[PDB]
Amino acid sequence: EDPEISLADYWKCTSCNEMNPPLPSHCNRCWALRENWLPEDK
Amino acid sequence: YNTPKYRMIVRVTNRDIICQIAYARIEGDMIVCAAYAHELPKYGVKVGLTNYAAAYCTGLLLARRLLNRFGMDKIYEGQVEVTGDEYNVESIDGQPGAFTCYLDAGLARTTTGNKVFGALKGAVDGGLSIPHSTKRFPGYDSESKEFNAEVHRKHIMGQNVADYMRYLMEEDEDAYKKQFSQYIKNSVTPDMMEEMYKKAHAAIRENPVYEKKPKKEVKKKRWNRPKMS
Amino acid sequence: QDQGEKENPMRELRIRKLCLNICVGESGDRLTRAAKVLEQLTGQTPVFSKARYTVRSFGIRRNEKIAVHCTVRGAKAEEILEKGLKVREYELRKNNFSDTGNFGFGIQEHIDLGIKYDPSIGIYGLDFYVVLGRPGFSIADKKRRTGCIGAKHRISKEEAMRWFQQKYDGIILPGK
RNA sequence: GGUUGCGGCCAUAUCUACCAGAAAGCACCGUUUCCCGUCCGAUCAACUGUAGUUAAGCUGGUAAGAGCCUGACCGAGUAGUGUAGUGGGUGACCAUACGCGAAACUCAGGUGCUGCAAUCU
Ligand SMILES: [Zn+2]
């Protein structure tokens, strides 16, 4: 749907196995956060 | 079997504009008349190319060249006055009819105010017969369903570029010097742009014979890579 | 020699649209305040984003008012990316750079960056996912004469890492 | 010898990797006051040909490069198939004789001509 983006930048879920797009940071199937997207706190 | 339904193809490059009028044959299309925007310096304006006024000038030059090639230049002079109203050519009784043609825009977007439609309107002002409406013009209103045609006249006269140059001069110094850099060269003032366009239109109506410069001092040295054995 | 900096006029690493976005758990005045915060941060009018499917894990109905997304281009997107890298303290370690040449992260709170917290306003963060580019990379998206961009002019992941460590002087590749 | 823009006959008419491209022309390319358009001048629409660039696009050549078509004792009259006899086999089937007959593979060739109009040599 986006002509400047590719399927290689799509994010495959580690919890729901769905190849979600770059936005948002929630999973397309499970709405969970992607792995190590925000900075991990100390 | 051989009746020529002529098409006027319009193409817009990033540094020039090409107009052609052709009727296709079995052995390929036959371009009876054509014009390039580089030839606009040979009649009038040596600067300010690829404008909507340049599209109207190219359409008028192509229409006058086609009328000279067809031999119907003396009758059907076209819209001599630069008016924004849509003018449709009526065929002369006792004479040949208007040279009907189709308009080949190609893969260009069919939006109102495009330069291809402006060249079509310039060809219609020159006297070339193609069916078209005033909806895809510069002065048409999409919400009022009407054409004001004074703004279309100013855009045909190139007064929009003159107003843009005036606003860039009164709003900045380096930007007006950078954008209209070669327009500042050779003294193209914000005034007399409509006068220069009218003089160029009158000169295009005066002498429409397209000519080529002879230069036959060409050798056949190979400047390209051929095939290895 | 001459091969060092000559393509840099026509093949420098440039930034395309950044497309800042946040996701709301519901709609209404929270979504209105999120859109107001997005308009205050970006300056452009944001775009509401609907749900693809009703998931109902945390509670979700399809095609509701779910998220807010916008595309930022130019020096404003560069300044927003600089503010995000300063919020991340120039630390994008391992999986931030992609193979195709995308970077990005997520900011936990809009209160720290940008404008300060208010009790009426929320503290919902956002996310950045910036796709880079080269001078002339948009040739495949034109209306006429579509063609490939070429592998040799594409951005590499190691090239993206070098571009990040040059443009931001950033810190990548943590021990974990 | 090159380029542009329309073309015609139409998969021998694809991709990938190097090397080149005099000259012009294309092409990226610079800017959004106005015509137009979106969340975003990214696309589309305007303005200049300046600031730059052959890095991509495009073209040519080179691959014992892969792919695609064409044929071929290329298997090969082969794997086998069906029938017949006065060989049998308890039969099934196997030979005999006849009448049809693949496929993968391999090898050879090619990975298209040309018009119109304009312009650089
Ligand atoms: Zn998931």
Numbering used by the authors:
A (entry chain F): 293 to 334
B (entry chain A): 44 to 272
C (entry chain B): 3 to 178
Task: Please give me the paper's original passages concerning this structure.
The 5S ribonucleoprotein (RNP) is assembled from its three components (5S rRNA, Rpl5/uL18 and Rpl11/uL5) before being incorporated into the pre-60S subunit. The 5S rRNA is separately transcribed by RNA polymerase III and, after joining with its cognate ribosomal proteins uL18 and uL5 (previously called Rpl5 and Rpl11, respectively), forms the minimal trimeric 5S RNP core complex, which is eventually incorporated into the pre-60S particle. However, when ribosome synthesis is disturbed, a free 5S RNP can enter the MDM2–p53 pathway to regulate cell cycle and apoptotic signaling. Here we reconstitute and determine the cryo-electron microscopy structure of the conserved hexameric 5S RNP with fungal or human factors.
Moreover, we could reconstitute a simpler 5S RNP complex, comprising the human factors uL18 and uL5, but instead of Syo1 and Rpf2–Rrs1, it carries the ubiquitin ligase Mdm2, which explains how a ribosome assembly intermediate can sequester this ubiquitinating enzyme from its substrate, p53. To reconstitute this putative intermediate, we co-expressed hsMdm2 (FLAG-tagged), hsuL5 (untagged) and hsuL18 (TEV-ProtA-tagged) in yeast, which together readily assembled into a Mdm2–5S RNP complex that was subsequently isolated by split-tag affinity purification and further fractionated by size-exclusion chromatography. We further solved the structure of the Mdm2–5S RNP complex by cryo-EM at an average resolution of 4.1 Å, which was sufficient to reveal how the Mdm2 zinc finger middle domain (residues 293–334) is integrated with the β-sheeted concave surface of hsuL5, as observed in the crystal structure. Furthermore, our cryo-EM density map shows how hsuL5 and hsuL18 remain attached to their cognate sites on the 5S rRNA while mediating contact with Mdm2. Notably, at lower contour levels or when filtered to low resolution, a globular density emerged that is connected to the Mdm2 zinc finger middle domain and located at the 5S rRNA middle stem, adjacent to uL18. We attribute this additional density in our Mdm2–5S RNP structure to the remainder of Mdm2, that is, the Mdm2 N-terminal (that is, the p53 binding domain), acidic and C-terminal RING finger (ubiquitin ligase) domains. Notably, this flexible Mdm2 density partly overlaps with the Rpf2–Rrs1-binding region, thus suggesting a competition between Mdm2 and the Rpf2–Rrs1 dimer for joining the 5S RNP. Thus, Mdm2 exhibits more than one contact point within the 5S RNP: one to uL5 involving the middle zinc finger domain and another one to the uL18 N-terminal extension. Both of these contacts overlap with the Syo1 binding regions, which also explains structurally why binding of Mdm2 or Syo1 to the 5S RNP is mutually exclusive. The position of Mdm2 caught between uL5 and uL18, bridged by the 5S rRNA, could explain why the inhibition of Mdm2 requires a fully assembled 5S RNP as observed before.
